[PDB]
Structures are given as structure tokens and as C-alpha cells.
Write a protein that binds this ligand. Structure first.
Ligand code: GCP
Ligand code: MET
Ligand code: MG
Ligand code: ZN
Lengths: 86, 105, 267, 470
RNA sequence: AGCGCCGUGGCGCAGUGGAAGCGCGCAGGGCUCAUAACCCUGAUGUCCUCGGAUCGAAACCGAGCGGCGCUACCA
RNA sequence: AAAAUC
């Protein structure tokens, strides 16, 4: 249940977008986007996708860094969250 | 695991042997794979072909995860379990031990 | 033969909206047949064809398919009709397709009648369809009211009574709409005797069943008792279920328990 | 070339089947070992205890063969809330030639009086030494009310320990100690994981377990290596059950009583309600026989809170329609077992966990409900069921006034408020009613780490009663 | 166990009563220097199985199957 | 208008 994983979508000119799918509601999302923006210097979106869920889209190609934020903010598991190569 | 990369296409011409040696039905394995990965691929007659850029490491790790959470017993060292449906859910049952443990995700 | 139109007149009026089957486009637009008026070819030119500029001259217009068009001009002298695709509102397209399917359904019914009776469809529409579309404004509403009231066939001369019998049989087979009304009630008993109370309350509930309205109070769980009823008119089932509520509450006020409702009678 | 059904039917008809109990036999000559009792009703309730994820239902299925109905689509997998009931029949081989360890055999309760010996080459017929009821108590650290209700129901015990895991499992010790709290001492030690262990490792595990059970009250606890999976050493378990565990004293000279632990609503859906059955309360009968057709009352019953916050308790009167003691309805009942008393009680009283741990009395007796209860309580030195990574396992403190404590009075699970605390006695106010019949051995659990943890034992010495309103 | 939803051509929605729909894909092409965007072209089905009124049904019903949803483990 | 790469 409620598995967590991150994906990378490429673009023109090597530019990349990162998506974490599934976020616990224990901590709210705007309060988390605020500190995502500073620590990442990348634009972010709390987008709604049907049958998928709320997604915090972020710019760039960063996986260990969103994970490093996750380990400190709410995540205490580091086992359910999956990293995708792509 | 043998992963054939053909341009945009990712081929597994060996998934039949994976299903046979792990004593798992092929369609259940495909369901698990596409619940893990976000793709919808086809099967040719014996081989699982998908359209994407997927590495061999991902295939190896999903096989290991399937082994640890589905194939081998989580309380004993045994593969002798197989797939059944006890009210409507998948309820795994073993043959060497017969223990009632079930994982459906 | 299947040639007659659905509406009254032969040539379209002005500023009316219909739905057209596309057949061919050459250089000025699509001069295509009509499927709501009398069969005639009208021209839909390019700047009257796509809300979007004209980038996909093959996509939005499909040779052999039907899309909504609007009458701009009608030359009621020789043969010419002007039609446009852009000048249809986003909401209006829904009513246009509603009217088109309406026309197609009535046309298919009368076409079955003509094919079985070998009468030209022109006579079927003249003797029947247009008087009903004059009395009620439409022939489909008239079939619907014929289902519930035969009197719509009074005052009109049929081509033959067997045609009337076959068409009434066909509309009864096709245009038939027994609304399923379900309520559910929670027995919240804590008292001494509740099972015989349920037994006799449901016995009384099944007793009031009429030959036309039948009620079988079924069980899905201990508290949840479901009342399923068929209502030929949608107003009798609610009264049946209210009477049932009275019966169960009266039975349970004396034995000691309590019975509560979750869903009252709703279709 | 006989089919399996034909062979089973031939063995059933050869062995005599299941003879119907006499409607009204002379009860002054009727011991729990009589054929009319032994073949068609349990006399000893034996229960299995163990830590989480050990296979508590699997061992009983191995012994008996009847499933506990691990229900609810979420309790299918992790843990059950309601207990697991099971019936098995102990049959000994009458021929002396076959080995004594293999002479015994536990079969299902559908078997006949005299089944043939399945050992290859043995023509002897099995004799039913006893039929035993099985109670499975869930061992999760939040659900302990059911385990203490079962312990109040219990008569014999079977403790389970895993091999490859750590020797000092807190939950097994908690189950054990709770059993010795409830005046129960017939405890048999079972090691389940021997198949995944080596020759030496099981020896150190048994040494550690032997050192573990040294200071507790129970001393003579036999140890059995079993396999819920390979299904071996079952006859040894049956032999130990029959030998080590005799019948606790129970006869027909005491007034009838009932302790309902489960609620069961007979509401088979889809069929017309013109054909229904009675609402069934599943309860243990610790004393007093019941016969087909009786007038009984659930003493706590209706619990209402009026416009002033006061509590009103109306006993639930009911006529007994059936007594599902075993697969076929019985004419009477035998103390020391679990029986489903199916009365005319409305099935919603039995739908959910409502008739959970309540006390029921036959007409002619008035068990007294109490609102404030005087209690004599003794406590243990340290908390149990908690894992401490090498620092002074938490010590049980002393009670304080005006606090909620889960006071499991036999089967009744109540949240009591302590009005006063003395050196050995305390006064408890119950927001949920409880009726005191004779002694009703109590267990106590305190909220120290979120969930409850057992503390000690208690006995009722006085109380403030409430008069039931008919 | 009971009552609600569904049955692709790879995926979804649509018509359900003239007999194979569209978009999403996928493949190729064109646009161009060149990637997206955009513009063309296809090749896949007793639209789950079995019966029935019906010129006719994949569509209307039903006698069964598979997977979802609620009641709720229904002695 | 929307214009992207380099
Ligand atoms: N190795 C081994 N595993 C077993 C055995 N019995 C059961 N298991 C496995 O261990 C787990 C425990 O079985 P289960 O019956 O679900 O546990 P339980 O004892 O009912 C749980 P609780 O103690 O909380 O009531 C299951 O996943 C099962 O596969 C056994 O004898 N050996
Ligand atoms: C067959 S009655 C015994 C208890 C029941 N099987 C539970 O649930
Ligand atoms: Mg259990
Ligand atoms: Zn196993």
C-alpha cells in the first residue's frame, strides 16, 4: 500500500523534471513546497492528477537531494521510497 | 536476467524461464512488473516486450524484490508456494510447508 | 423506399441548426447531404467550416460522418442551401445531436414499418408522423404519450390498421422505459424479542403487496433490511415503503426495541 | 476403485457414526467421560498462546483440522480480533503392538466413535479418550482483552516459542504470566521452528527457555518440538494433553451460569426473512448444565445513559431455541466448554462486538450487577510485554486516583476509574457494567506506553450493586 | 454468502438497437538544417462466453464467467 | 499573440 517512487522526465536541451508520486498528508504541502524551493532553487507544482494523486513536480534532475529532504522532513523509513533510473 | 536493448524497445526474451524457475504464473509476474513500473507492454510467443528506456539493474532489482516479497517464504527458506485465491484476493499457499501468508501488493 | 424527411417542410427555414453527413469537399467547401430536412445538398465553405483556422482540413471534417451544421441561407427557388459549422454554440451542439438522434430513432422505426409493409415512407409520414408532430410538436413525444394514452391516434386516418398494430407493437418493444425503488432500514434492537417482530413486520409488509406492485424485503445483514419495490408510476412505491416504515415501527414500539431508518424511499 | 467419499462413508458407518444424545439422561451418573458426552461435546478447553506472527491458528489446524475463519479481509493476514474456536477428538489405538507415541491421534469432530488406525498394517479401532475444545487468543500488543477473556475461559494451555528468533520473547512471557494469573497451571511448552534450526542451536534455545521458566509459579511444564508445517509430533502432543492435564473439578451440583464472549447473528443473506433462525450468543459455560429450551437472561444487557448521565441496566431475557455445542444440535450442555446458545435475541444484539465478555444467568438466580466495586489487588515487580535493549525492564508503579485502567474481570473488559488507592485494596467505578457472581478472578492492565500493559491480579471482595429493572 | 459497476484494436470514452468508433498510443511519412509543436497515413475485434424476440444486434434481455464496489464473516 | 533549441 501507498508506495512512494520518483520519476524523471527529460526535455529539449538536457533539461529535466522530477516527480515524486504519493506524499503523506501528515505534513501539509505548501509548507513543504516553501522549503523545497529554497533548498533546490527549482520551480515546483502541486499538481492534481486523477486516480494518481497530488504530485510535487520539481525542476532539474535531483534524486538523492529530494531523498535527503525526505529523510529529514517526514520520512523515517527510507525503504518504501523508490528511486527510478530511467 | 537478460535484457535486450533495441533502440527505443526493451525486450525480455527470457521471462518465460524466469516464470518457470520461480514457479510463478507469467501473467501474475507481468501484473507485478507493471504495478511496479509505469508502463503497459505486450507479450509475444514467451517474451515480454515494452517500449521504453529501461536498464538491466532495474530488472534485476524488481526480480529480487519479487523473490523476497512473493516467491520465497518470508518465514521459511522455500519456493514451494504457489498462487491461489481464498474471499476473492490472492492468498498465497505453500506446498512444502503450507503456511497461510498472503501479499497482494 | 426510404426518402421522406422527418420535419414538415421541404426546404429549410432560416437560422435553424441541423446535423449533416459529409460526403465530399472539392475547393470551395463541403457540399453534403442533409439528414434532418428533406435530403438535399448544402454547401459549407471553409471560413464557415472550422472554429480553428484551417490547419487540419482532413481531421475536423470527415467524409462519411455526421457533424452539426447551421442554416445560413436557403434559396427556395432551385436547389441551394448554405450551411456553416462554426456558428454553433458549445451548449447548442448537445441539443443538435439530441434532435438528430431523435429524428434518426423515429426514422428507423418508421423505416422498419415501411420495410415490413412495403408502403413508401412518404405516405407513412404524411398519414401519421406530421399530424402527431403538429398535435404535440413532435412525433417522438407522441409515441411516448401513445404508450401511456392511445388517444393520440384519434382523429388521424392510418394507411391501414395493421400498420397501426405493427407500429404500436414496435414502440412497445422499443420505447418502453417499473422504476426500482429501494429503501433501507436499521433495526437497532436491544430488547427481548426482535426476531418474531421482524418476521411478522415483514409478513405484514409482504401482505400489502399488490398483483402489480410486489415487495420482497430482503436481508443483506443483521441491521440492514433492504426494501426493494417496483413502481409502474414512481409514486406508489414511496407510499408502500412509508406504510412499511409504519408497520415495523409499530411492531417494535411494543416488543421494546427500536428501529431506525437510513435511506427512505428513493428511486 | 472406491472414491474418497465412499471410503469415508464406509469408515463412518463401520465406526458407528455420531449417535444422538439422549434427550433427558440421568444427570447424577453422567461424568464428562461418558460416551454420550465424549463423542458429541467438549469437556476441556485447551488454548494456544504465542507471540505475534508465529502460526497460532496453524498449529490448531494441524491438531484439529477446522479453520478459525480468519475474517475481515485485513485480519486475513496480520492478526485476528475474535478468538479461533476449534474441535478435535483424541483417539488412542487399542492394539498394544503399535508404538505408544504413535498410538494417539487427534481427528476432526466429524469422525465416528471407532475409526480405523491409519498406520500401515494396523487393524485396530481408535477409542475416543476425550474430545477437547480449542481456544486461540490473539497475541498482539494492542489486543489483550480477548486474550484475558479466553484465559478466564481457559482450562488447559499450550505455549509456543519460535526457534530462529530471540529467546526472550516478551509476548510469550506475557501470555504465560496472564495464564498463571487465572488459576491455570497446566501449561505445555511448544517449540515450533525446529525444521529451520540446527542440531546445536535448538539445544541452546531449550537451555535458555528452561532457565527462563524457573522462578515463575509453574514448574513442571513439558516441552514439545512441533511443526505446524511438516505436521509431525502431533500424537505426542495428544499424549501429553491426555496424561498431564486431568479434568478440573466440574459436576452438576452448582447453579447454572454462562459467560458470553462472542456475538453471532444468523442472517444468511439473499433468502426470504420468512425463514430465519435465532440470534446466537457464543459463550463458555463454566458451571451448570443447559438443556434444549430454557429461559435465560443476559444480566448486563441493555446499558442506557439517561438525561442525567446515570446508568440503567436491563437484563436481556430470552428463550433458548438451540445449543450449538457441536456440529449437530445437542439436547443438553456440559460445563467446561464453549457453546453457542441460540435464543430469540434480535440478531443486531449479536451483529457486532456487542455481546463481548458479558455474564448470563438462568431463571431462578439473580446475578448482581455492580457500579462501584471494592477490589483486592496484587501486582508484579516489573512491566511485561516490553522490549528493553539492555536497561532495567520497566518496573510497575503504584496506582493513583481518578485514572482509567482496563480491568478485565474474567471476560468483562471495562475501563475503570480508581476512586481510592490503599496498600492492597482499591475502589473502581465502572462506566460499563459488570455483574459479580462468585469471585470472578480479575486481571488489570495499565496504559503506560500508549497501549495497555498487564500489571497484576485482583479479587472482588465487596461491591455497590444496582437493582435490575424487569 | 447477498445487492451494485465493468468487459478494446495496445489504453480510455462512446454509441447502444443499419453491423466496427474516436482520442490516446504505436509505426511510418511530411513540415525543417533540426528537435519538439503541428500536418497526413495506417494495422489490429463472436467490444467476456452461451441462448432468445428481432430482415437485422457487439447494442434488448436472460443463464453463466472473470475483475472491481458496498453489506458484512453473516451459528 | 504563442517562439521554443544552439
Ligand atoms: N516457519 C514457519 N512459519 C510459519 C509457521 N506457521 C505459520 N508460519 C508463518 O508465519 C506467520 C504466522 O502465521 P499466522 O497463523 O498468520 O500467525 P498467528 O500466530 O496467527 C499471529 P498472532 O500470534 O498475533 O495471533 C505466517 O505468515 C505464516 O506463513 C510454522 O510452523 N513455521
Ligand atoms: C461453527 S461455530 C464455532 C465458531 C465460529 N466458527 C466462529 O466464527
Ligand atoms: Mg488467530
Ligand atoms: Zn513456506
Amino acid at each position: 500500500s501507498n508506495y512512494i517512487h520518483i520519476r524523471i522526465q527529460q526535455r529539449n536541451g538536457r533539461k529535466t523534471l522530477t516527480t515524486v508520486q504519493g506524499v503523506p498528508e501528515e505534513y501539509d504541502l505548501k509548507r513543504i513546497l516553501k522549503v523545497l524551493k529554497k533548498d533546490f532553487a527549482c520551480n515546483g507544482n502541486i499538481v492534481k492528477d486523477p486516480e494518481m494523486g497530488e504530485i510535487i513536480q520539481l525542476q532539474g534532475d535531483q534524486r538523492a537531494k529530494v531523498c535527503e529532504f525526505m529523510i529529514s522532513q517526514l520520512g523515517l523509513q527510507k525503504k518504501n521510497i523508490k528511486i527510478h533510473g530511467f | 536476467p537478460v535484457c535486450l536493448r533495441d533502440g527505443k524497445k526493451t525486450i525480455f526474451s527470457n521471462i518465460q524461464d524466469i516464470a518457470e524457475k520461480l514457479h510463478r504464473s507469467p501473467e501474475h509476474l507481468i501484473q507485478y512488473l507493471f504495478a511496479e513500473l509505469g508502463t503497459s507492454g505486450s507479450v509475444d510467443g514467451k517474451r515480454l516486450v515494452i517500449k521504453g528506456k529501461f536498464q538491466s539493474k532495474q530488472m534485476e532489482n524488481v526480480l529480487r524484490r519479487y523473490i523476497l516479497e512473493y516467491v520465497t517464504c518470508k518465514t521459511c527458506k522455500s519456493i514451494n508456494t504457489e498462487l491461489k485465491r481464498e474471499n476473492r484476493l490472492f492468498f498465497m499457499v505453500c506446498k512444502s510447508c503450507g503456511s497461510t501468508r498472503s501479499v497482494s501488493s | 423506399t426510404s426518402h421522406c424527411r422527418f420535419y414538415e417542410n421541404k426546404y429549410p427555414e432560416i437560422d435553424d441548426i441541423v446535423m449533416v453527413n459529409v460526403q465530399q469537399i472539392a475547393e470551395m467547401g463541403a457540399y453534403v447531404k442533409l439528414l434532418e430536412y428533406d435530403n438535399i445538398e448544402g454547401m459549407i465553405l471553409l471560413s464557415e467550416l472550422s472554429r480553428r483556422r484551417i490547419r487540419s482540413i482532413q481531421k475536423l471534417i470527415r467524409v462519411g460522418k455526421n457533424d452539426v451544421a447551421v442554416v445560413l441561407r436557403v434559396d427556395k427557388e432551385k436547389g441551394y442551401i448554405d450551411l456553416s459549422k462554426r456558428r454553433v454554440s458549445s451548449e447548442d451542439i448537445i441539443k443538435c445531436e439530441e434532435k438528430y438522434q431523435k429524428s434518426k430513432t423515429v426514422h428507423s422505426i418508421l423505416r422498419y414499418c415501411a420495410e415490413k409493409f412495403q408502403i413508401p415512407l412518404e405516405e407513412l409520414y404524411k398519414t401519421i408522423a406530421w399530424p402527431l408532430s403538429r398535435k404535440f410538436g413532435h412525433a417522438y413525444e407522441a409515441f411516448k404519450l401513445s404508450i401511456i394514452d392511445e388517444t393520440v391516434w384519434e382523429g388521424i386516418e392510418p394507411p391501414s390498421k395493421d400498420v397501426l398494430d405493427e407500429l404500436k407493437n414496435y414502440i412497445s418493444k422499443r420505447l418502453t422505459p417499473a422504476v426500482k425503488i429501494r429503501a433501507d432500514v436499521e433495526v437497532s434492537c436491544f430488547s427481548y424479542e426482535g426476531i418474531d417482530a421482524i418476521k411478522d413486520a415483514l409478513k405484514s409488509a409482504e401482505d400489502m403487496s399488490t398483483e402489480q406492485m410486489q415487495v420482497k424485503v430482503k436481508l443483506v445483514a443483521a441491521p440492514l433490511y433492504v426494501l426493494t419495490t417496483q413502481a409502474l408510476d414512481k409514486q406508489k412505491g414511496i407510499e408502500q415503503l412509508e406504510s412499511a416504515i409504519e408497520k415495523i415501527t409499530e411492531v417494535i414500539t411494543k416488543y421494546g426495541g427500536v428501529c431506525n431508518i437510513t435511506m427512505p424511499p428513493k428511486a | 476403485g472406491e472414491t474418497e467419499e465412499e471410503k469415508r462413508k464406509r469408515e463412518f458407518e463401520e465406526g458407528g457414526g455420531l449417535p444422538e444424545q439422549p434427550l433427558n439422561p440421568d444427570f447424577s451418573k453422567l461424568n464428562p467421560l461418558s460416551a454420550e458426552i465424549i463423542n458429541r461435546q467438549a469437556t476441556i478447553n485447551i488454548g494456544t498462546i504465542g507471540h505475534v506472527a508465529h502460526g497460532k491458528s496453524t498449529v490448531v489446524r494441524a491438531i484439529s483440522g477446522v479453520q478459525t475463519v480468519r475474517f475481515k479481509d485485513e485480519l486475513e493476514r496480520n492478526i485476528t480480533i475474535k478468538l479461533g474456536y476449534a474441535n478435535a477428538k483424541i483417539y488412542k489405538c487399542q492394539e498394544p503392538t503399535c508404538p505408544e507415541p504413535d498410538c494417539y491421534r487427534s481427528f476432526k469432530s466429524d469422525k465416528e466413535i471407532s475409526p480405523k488406525c491409519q498406520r500401515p498394517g494396523c487393524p485396530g479401532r481408535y477409542k475416543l479418550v476425550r474430545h477437547v475444545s480449542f481456544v486461540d487468543c490473539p497475541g498482539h500488543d494492542i489486543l489483550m482483552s480477548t486474550m484475558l477473556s479466553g484465559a478466564a475461559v481457559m482450562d488447559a494451555a499450550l505455549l509456543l516459542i519460535a526457534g530462529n528468533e530471540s529467546c526472550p520473547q516478551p509476548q510469550t512471557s506475557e501470555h504465560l504470566a496472564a495464564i498463571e494469573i487465572m488459576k491455570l497451571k497446566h501449561v505445555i511448552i511448544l517449540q515450533n521452528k525446529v525444521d529451520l534450526m540446527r542440531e546445536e542451536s535448538a539445544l541452546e534455545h531449550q537451555k535458555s527457555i528452561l532457565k527462563f521458566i524457573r522462578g515463575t509459579i509453574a514448574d513442571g511444564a513439558p516441552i514439545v518440538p512441533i511443526s505446524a508445517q511438516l505436521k509431525y509430533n502431533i500424537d505426542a502432543v495428544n499424549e501429553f494433553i491426555v496424561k498431564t492435564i486431568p479434568v478440573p473439578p466440574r459436576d452438576f451440583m452448582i447453579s447454572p451460569r454462562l459467560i458470553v464472549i462472542r456475538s453471532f447473528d444468523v442472517n444468511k443473506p439473499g433468502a426470504e426473512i420468512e425463514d430465519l433462525k435465532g440470534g446466537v450468543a457464543g459463550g463458555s459455560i463454566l458451571n451448570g448444565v443447559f438443556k434444549l429450551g430454557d429461559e435465560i437472561e443476559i444480566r448486563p444487557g441493555i446499558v442506557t445513559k439517561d438525561d442525567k448521565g446515570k446508568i440503567q441496566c436491563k437484563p436481556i431475557f430470552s428463550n433458548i431455541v438451540s445449543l450449538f455445542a457441536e456440529q449437530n444440535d445437542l439436547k443438553f450442555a456440559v460445563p467446561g466448554g464453549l457453546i453457542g446458545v441460540g435464543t430469540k435475541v434480535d440478531p443486531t444484539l449479536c451483529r457486532a462486538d456487542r455481546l463481548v465478555g458479558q455474564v448470563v444467568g438462568a431463571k431462578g438466580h439473580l446475578p448482581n450487577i455492580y457500579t462501584d466495586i471494592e477490589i483486592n489487588y496484587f501486582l508484579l515487580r516489573r512491566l511485561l510485554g516490553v522490549k528493553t535493549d539492555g536497561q532495567k525492564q520497566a518496573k510497575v508503579r503504584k496506582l493513583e486516583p481518578n485514572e482509567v485502567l482496563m480491568v478485565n474481570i474474567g471476560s468483562t473488559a471495562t475501563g475503570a476509574r480508581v476512586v481510592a488507592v490503599k496498600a492492597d485494596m482499591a475502589r473502581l467505578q465502572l462506566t460499563s457494567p459488570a455483574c459479580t457472581e462468585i469471585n470472578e478472578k480479575i486481571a488489570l492492565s495499565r496504559r503506560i506506553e500508549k497501549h495497555w500493559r498487564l500489571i497484576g491480579w485482583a479479587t472482588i471482595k465487596k461491591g455497590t450493586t444496582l437493582e435490575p429493572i424487569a
